[PDB]
Design an enzyme around this catalytic site. Structure first.
Site, PDB file in Angstrom:
ATOM      1  N   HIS A 112      -8.592 -37.602 -16.481  1.00  0.00           N
ATOM      2  CA  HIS A 112      -8.893 -38.210 -15.109  1.00  0.00           C
ATOM      3  C   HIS A 112     -10.284 -38.821 -15.042  1.00  0.00           C
ATOM      4  CE1 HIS A 112      -5.299 -36.161 -13.142  1.00  0.00           C
ATOM      5  NE2 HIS A 112      -5.444 -35.378 -14.220  1.00  0.00           N
ATOM      6  N   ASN A 148      -1.677 -33.642  -8.379  1.00  0.00           N
ATOM      7  CA  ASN A 148      -1.262 -35.008  -8.861  1.00  0.00           C
ATOM      8  C   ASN A 148      -0.233 -35.646  -7.926  1.00  0.00           C
ATOM      9  OD1 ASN A 148      -2.804 -34.792 -11.264  1.00  0.00           O
ATOM     10  ND2 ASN A 148      -1.058 -34.101 -12.540  1.00  0.00           N
ATOM     11  N   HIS A 208     -12.192 -27.921  -8.985  1.00  0.00           N
ATOM     12  CA  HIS A 208     -11.661 -26.937  -9.956  1.00  0.00           C
ATOM     13  C   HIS A 208     -10.675 -26.093  -9.144  1.00  0.00           C
ATOM     14  CE1 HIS A 208     -11.578 -23.959 -13.252  1.00  0.00           C
ATOM     15  NE2 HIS A 208     -11.706 -23.110 -12.284  1.00  0.00           N
TER      16      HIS A 208
END
Ligand code: HEM
Ligand code: HEM
Ligand code: HEM
Lengths: 726, 726, 308, 83
Positions: free
Chosen positions: B101, B174, B365
């Protein structure tokens, strides 16, 4: 709750003498000591009381005692993000230490000039006596690592960051007026030679090994600074009691564009004072943090380190008027030839909060100058200007080290530089280049001028071919070491002989000792022969016949180069051990403590065990340490009051206490029956200069002791020490 | 002063449509758009107007055009500290890009829940509909570098940092509801297979190469997400018109300690929309920043990206009630079995000021959760928890990355962690450990509770031996690909066949193509035969007889898996090219432009050169771009008003503009003599669905064009586009 | 030639007792000593005699005593690439020290089992009394920096890297058989407590300060290892005369899959011996490198450290 | 120094010289070369001053800069000939 009911865990936020209270972060010890830099760091100080324990993401932790496991005797789980963040942060705590000057201790303070210096420089921080500039100062050794000891024999660094309204100016100096080498190209070679040797990484914090003296023997330019290091200059009593020097000749530039050459000085207002060698060595074992602790505790007591900034000023037309090159950083400018003008005072009055964040991460660099200062072509300075920008890129992680809080300017800073690891500033300018129209060319260049102007270099004329060549003018190596030697008192000279004899005795290859003694015979035959005798070397006839180097501009000595030749002793902030017994004469103690207080001298009350003793009159006397626990190494003078002298007269540790203080030339005062101790130090019945004795501790006994303390050590005792076993 | 006198260098600080003004930093374009995180960044925002240019030490610069040299044609001097600081910072501007990414575009916004979710979770940010949580969102591709193109075929990332009052929560998702692999141990293998091949580092931003398909042919668990990538889900029109998913099942924990399984969703309030493959591929060439641009310009226009957060909730007792494992991230939960419950709305309403400082340094994260959330044993999620903390230590330079401004919590954070590279916080706590008495144990642990409590993990039962073993429940690979295929419209299924055909045509080793076709024959024979026919491969009789996999819990389709099967089109924020001529019918253009403005659709006026053209009635029309400069790729429909059509009728660029729009299924409207372009695109006299045509742009002409725009593309044209060379 | 004519600059390449010769790099002092790991390092060993002084790009240097300047009293020129490479490498010599165990001293050696242990473990290095495994061993203190003193009161580390034919095995132990704490989550708290206090970074190499004893008084699990540390175990005479322990229970696994619990020990074959406290504290002053020197000189004399 | 992680980038295999290189530089992150020289400085006697400087000459000589004449004041100024 875990703190004691009585609040004794927390130090008072008032000045207190060494030992009285646990030490503390500076903002909690002295919350109302302020300066513009200390106030600007408030945005990044973090407190703790009454806050919940969290992760670095702000999540509150319930159990900070255990990893997450599958069953209470089971395996630790990878999903334990609280354990992993805490151990990851711990695993990454360390950063590279500084390549040199890794061991250092630092404090905040402020500087103010005594008068405007506009006639000689347009530097804004020197323009008005009412301009107060915050400073941060770091003192350091050179060779050892960050965990090495403080009272080693070494040069000391003395670096000052001035947060001016026209930029940060870093004056990055040492405690002797010259350096070991002439050209920065040789710095890795000299530093590699002095550092621990590469096969085994020994010795730490010591120049007394073969590669150092191999390089010195082959590079006679080093001998001047080696003389200073072997003197008692190499073992200061305190960072408060040493001189500083910028070493290089720099330039001052005034508003009309006139350049004046300058060398910078710091004069200690507490005076000059050093340890003796055996005391310094022993103190590296008993308190390797002695100078870090002395600095911190002086500031917590209000005994602020104060220095006067001084300039030696030489007009441009006088560049060639001396018989050494002003650009040669192995040459000093004798104060008898060019006096030091006293320009202002710096006071260090607050310790950091967090050693790592403020001291370890501080970056000083002598290329950080401001308009009104400029460089010269000194070839050692010229290479420094490259190294400090470079080293900071790996030590501090990238090019945004100026954003680490202690390094930030307090004045505005704006430019077109962007990105870089851990970039803090978020620029809003539409442009990141100039010239630009899209932001009307802001931020804009500023022409040079008398105040608030941009920096322009002084237009020195350069004429010569591109050469790697030492100036012939720099090729004289023995006259300044001789001037230094001839300026020392006779006991300072003995201490230099002893420093070279100790050092060269630890050189294993004897030819290196012989090559160093040959160099010494080019400086002074008395010194050479005294060192040679101690090594079992005999000078040859050729050596005995080497012509002494010339005087320096007609000088055959300069007393300003001695620590002790001109009295400048000051006792405020010094410390006396008082050796107690179980039935102390209280009247002796009241008298002692009162006279010490009046002069700002601290006391430490010592005995056989922790606890208390009771005086003849019922006063309870809290004991700070044992005789063995706080040795004489850590104090300036020892006083033994009366009472049950019978009780300690036999104590091995009390006896040794006085033998070691005696050997180290410290004032000792004995009252009443404490005169029994004369026998352990072999003092004649009629007394000795440096031993104060009377029937009781009256007001006269204290004046005599305090006069001895103002003179620091009892040099006249040196021939007597050899025959006590200590 | 270099700005124009007219002030045209500076964009209006008000919402403006794409192309109307130069783009700018968010706090200059929209100063009054605020939230608690944007306000908390004020301490580090740096302006520029009216400030002097300085070094990073605050020293003003006089001449930022030249190096210091000995003579104006002489060598540069080492003492030039202003040149070496500026070039040092430039030389260290780059940091490592993200491992995956690396290409992404980000914006600020805010989230609010529709109602309190206190019955199912104690997470504070979901507790109150009047509680607004600032967010920062980054959207990304997966494979290409930070300099790769946006409209590649790939999965997209959708990462949201929620700055809550109880800690940062990062939802790192995603745009498809499953991942390619089951266990994090394989993630380096999969990502090495999709990334450029290691001998030559080709291809960028493409999975169409031999190592990707070699891995997919050998690991059938990948086929489900491969189906989604080969569909038009792999080529979104904008980040505004894609779905988001957390993929893993996580847990919600309420104050009574009940755990509920949850999967997270984002619904795009602008609807679902994708490009077609030839248009996406060509757009990677003509505008590789198309999605980054479209996002930034939508926010500058006020067309704020909005998304609704939704939850699929499964009670703990229903864990084993489906044909697939809830913990398997290669399986989706069909919405026909478990509906998405609407939870709240997120609006992205301000761009960053500096892309590097805020986007490139942001760290998201999925281990950053808050009390009220927890993990599950999904074995892909479990390894992710290790990776994000670890990678941030080298990408962002050490363990203090939470102190980089974008990453800082807005809530309190206090603990005993210290030091690390570029440490900003200066801790004043006397203690750096717990338990301590010297600061009365602060900061202190906090027990778990309903609100403002410490984090405690849900006490899930673990039972089994220490094994490296895949659960047998995860060993089924073809049913969810088949469910996806059967849920697509016929034109979406054609686009999938075309995606696999184009991809496998770029695989050099033909046996890999044959192995992939064999895997397709396990999913659906129709799909396998259609891809085989395009590859010149004939299925064997064995392949023709493979029995299809079972339905998923009785479903043979689920329309929520299609982009288009249930219309959700929204035209606001879309863009129309208007092809000008040198004497446009001003009444057509008034009618066209106001209709588009009324529905929030933007226009771009195009011609064969820049400057202006004059309408029939004298209105001066400004030209935004040329037909080649702003190709049809960049717009959603094309309008040709009447006027002097012979000006543009033989312009190859104008004609090809319509041919390319026609091929890519876009609506086209032709007024008046612009109907002469019907011959270019071979339209019948009697017209065809998808082409709007009238004698003028009035009456229903604009309503018909807008109706076509709401249905995104003219899918009925697909059989007609082959008889066009474009 | 700067070396003396008589050759007394170069130490004898043979075993000699402490103080008899200058110490030297091991492959020059003891060229005949070898093992598989020392042999595999030869591709990165660089010599020096008879070679020209160069840049790191291999360009020979003519004058390594001067910067390039415009005139011999002029400014240094930015085109001096030889000065900038040399100073740049110097400027970047340091790396972070270890978070704990930063002070340490290491040597190469070899290990061999007395008999095959295949009945209890399938570890290859323990399978054959003829199988010799190279080792590299580092001994250390815990608290102090890399520049702190050796004969402090502290626990010592004893870390062995075994270069086996089935992988590297590191046995990372200490010189007492237990540790201070029970759960790794508390390591940063315990290590912060024993390390120099955060305001002033004192004291170095010493646990005798408030924060250490505050933690200990609040965490009685620490008291076992604190008793060892306060004993003369905390002040060994040499790394050659201390025990080593792995502390934790590990497992041995044999070919049949059977697990046996194991705790690892090193027995010093020179025996156990410690200093006394006043001696140890005084030696930190007089020779802060005393254990690193004693280890290096024992090896140069042939008095090789041996452990079972 | 930042792109390649420290001052030993010449030891990354592609950047290594194929001709000899010896000097007194030591350490730095990910140092590969293990120097046996007893000395890490020059001048030294303990290794008879090796590796040694080499005078310039026709072939295999040390590097010496051409002795260009420099005459001008220290200025930040563009040469008028470049305008
Ligand atoms: C007159 C001679 C010099 C003096 C007075 C001087 C003084 C100092 C002092 C006081 C410090 C420590 C500053 C602090 O406390 O952080 C220091 C550090 C340093 N010095 Fe110098 N030095 C001299 C020569 C040199 C030369 C010739 C070089 C290299 C060309 C050099 C390179 C360095 C470096 C690399 C550091 C570490 C800086 C850091 O990591 O931030 N020094 N020096
Ligand atoms: C459900 C499967 C996954 C999803 C939805 C996912 C999503 C993402 C997203 C959206 C980003 C970019 C965040 C940003 O914009 O900065 C990212 C980065 C990253 N991912 Fe994941 N990922 C998945 C699995 C994995 C696995 C299995 C690993 C490794 C075990 C992994 C390791 C990384 C790393 C190393 C980064 C770069 C993070 C950074 O440098 O800050 N991902 N992923
Ligand atoms: C039984 C308890 C332990 C023993 C015997 C032990 C032993 C050691 C030894 C001997 C070293 C130095 C290795 C060398 O010479 O380079 C060391 C380093 C280290 N230890 Fe441990 N330790 C223990 C517990 C811990 C714990 C609980 C942690 C963290 C959870 C830890 C983290 C470290 C770290 C971070 C290093 C530095 C490693 C390096 O930089 O390469 N130790 N330990």
């Amino acid at each position: 709750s875990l703190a004691p009911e009585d609040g004794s865990h927390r130090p008072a936020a008032e000045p207190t003498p060494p030992g009285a209270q646990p030490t503390a972060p500076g903002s909690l010890k002295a919350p109302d000591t302020r300066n513009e830099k200390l106030n600007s760091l408030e945005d990044v100080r973090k407190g703790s009381e009454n806050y919940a324990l969290t992760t670095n993401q702000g999540v509150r932790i319930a159990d900070d005692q255990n990893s997450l496991r599958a069953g209470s005797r089971g395996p630790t789980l990878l999903e334990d993000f609280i354990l992993r963040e805490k151990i990851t942060h711990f695993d990454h705590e360390r950063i590279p230490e500084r390549i040199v000057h890794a061991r250092g201790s630092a404090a905040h303070g402020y500087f103010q000039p005594y008068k405007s210096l506009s006639d000689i420089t347009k530097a804004d921080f020197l323009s008005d006596p009412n301009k107060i500039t915050p400073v941060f100062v770091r003192f350091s050794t050179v060779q050892g690592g960050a965990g090495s000891a403080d009272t080693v024999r070494d040069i000391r660094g003395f670096a000052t960051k001035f947060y001016t309204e026209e930029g940060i100016f870093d004056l990055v100096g040492n405690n002797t007026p010259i350096f070991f080498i002439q050209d920065a190209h040789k710095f890795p070679d000299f530093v590699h030679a002095v550092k621990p040797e590469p096969h085994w990484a020994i010795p730490q914090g010591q120049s007394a090994h073969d590669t150092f003296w191999d390089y010195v023997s082959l590079q006679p330019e080093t001998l001047h600074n080696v003389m200073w290091a072997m003197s008692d200059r190499g073992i200061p009593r305190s960072y408060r009691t040493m001189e500083g020097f910028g070493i290089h000749t720099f330039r001052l530039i005034n508003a009309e564009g006139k350049a004046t050459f300058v060398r910078f000085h710091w004069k200690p207002l507490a005076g000059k004072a050093s340890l003796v060698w055996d005391e310094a060595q022993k103190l590296t074992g008993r308190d390797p943090d002695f100078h870090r602790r002395e600095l911190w505790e002086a500031i917590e007591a209000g005994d602020f380190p104060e220095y006067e900034l001084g300039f030696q000023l030489i007009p441009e037309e006088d560049e060639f008027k001396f018989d050494f090159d002003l650009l040669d950083p192995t040459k000093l400018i004798p104060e008898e030839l060019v006096p030091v003008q006293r320009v202002g005072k710096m006071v260090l009055n607050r310790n950091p909060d967090n050693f790592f964040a403020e001291n370890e991460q501080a970056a000083f660099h002598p290329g950080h100058i401001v308009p009104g200062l400029d460089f010269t072509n000194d070839p050692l300075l010229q290479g420094r200007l490259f190294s400090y920008t470079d080293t900071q890129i790996s030590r501090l992680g990238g090019p945004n080290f100026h954003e680490i809080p202690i390094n930030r300017p307090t004045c505005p800073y704006h430019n077109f530089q962007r990105d870089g690891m851990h970039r803090m500033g978020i620029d809003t300018n539409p442009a990141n280049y100039e010239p630009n129209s899209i932001n009307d060319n802001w931020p804009r260049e500023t022409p040079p001028g008398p105040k608030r102007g941009g920096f322009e270099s002084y237009q020195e004329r350069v004429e010569g071919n591109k050469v790697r060549e030492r100036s012939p003018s720099f090729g004289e190596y023995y006259s300044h070491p001789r001037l230094f030697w001839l300026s020392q008192t006779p006991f300072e000279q003995r201490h230099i002989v002893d420093g070279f004899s100790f050092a060269l005795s630890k050189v294993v290859r004897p030819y290196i000792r012989e090559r160093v003694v040959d160099q010494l015979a080019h400086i002074d035959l008395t010194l050479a022969q005294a060192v040679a005798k101690n090594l079992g070397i005999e000078l040859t006839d050729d050596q005995l016949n080497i012509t002494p180097p010339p005087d320096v501009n007609g000088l055959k000595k300069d007393p300003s180069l001695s620590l002790y030749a001109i009295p400048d002793g000051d006792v405020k902030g010094r410390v006396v051990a008082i050796l107690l017994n179980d039935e102390v004469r209280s009247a002796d103690l009241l008298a002692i403590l009162k006279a010490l207080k009046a002069k700002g001298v601290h006391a430490k009350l010592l005995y056989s065990r922790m606890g208390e003793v009771t005086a003849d009159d019922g006063t309870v006397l809290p004991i700070a340490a044992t005789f063995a626990g706080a040795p004489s190494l850590t104090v300036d003078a020892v006083i033994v009051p009366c009472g049950n002298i019978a009780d300690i007269a036999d104590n091995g540790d009390a006896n040794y206490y006085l033998m070691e203080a005696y050997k180290h030339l410290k004032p000792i005062a004995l009252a009443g029956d404490a005169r029994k101790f004369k026998a352990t130090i072999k003092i004649a019945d009629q007394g000795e200069e440096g031993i104060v004795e009377a029937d009781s501790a009256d007001g006269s006994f204290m004046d005599e002791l305090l006069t001895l303390m103002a003179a620091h050590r009892v040099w006249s005792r040196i021939p007597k020490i050899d025959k006590i076993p200590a």
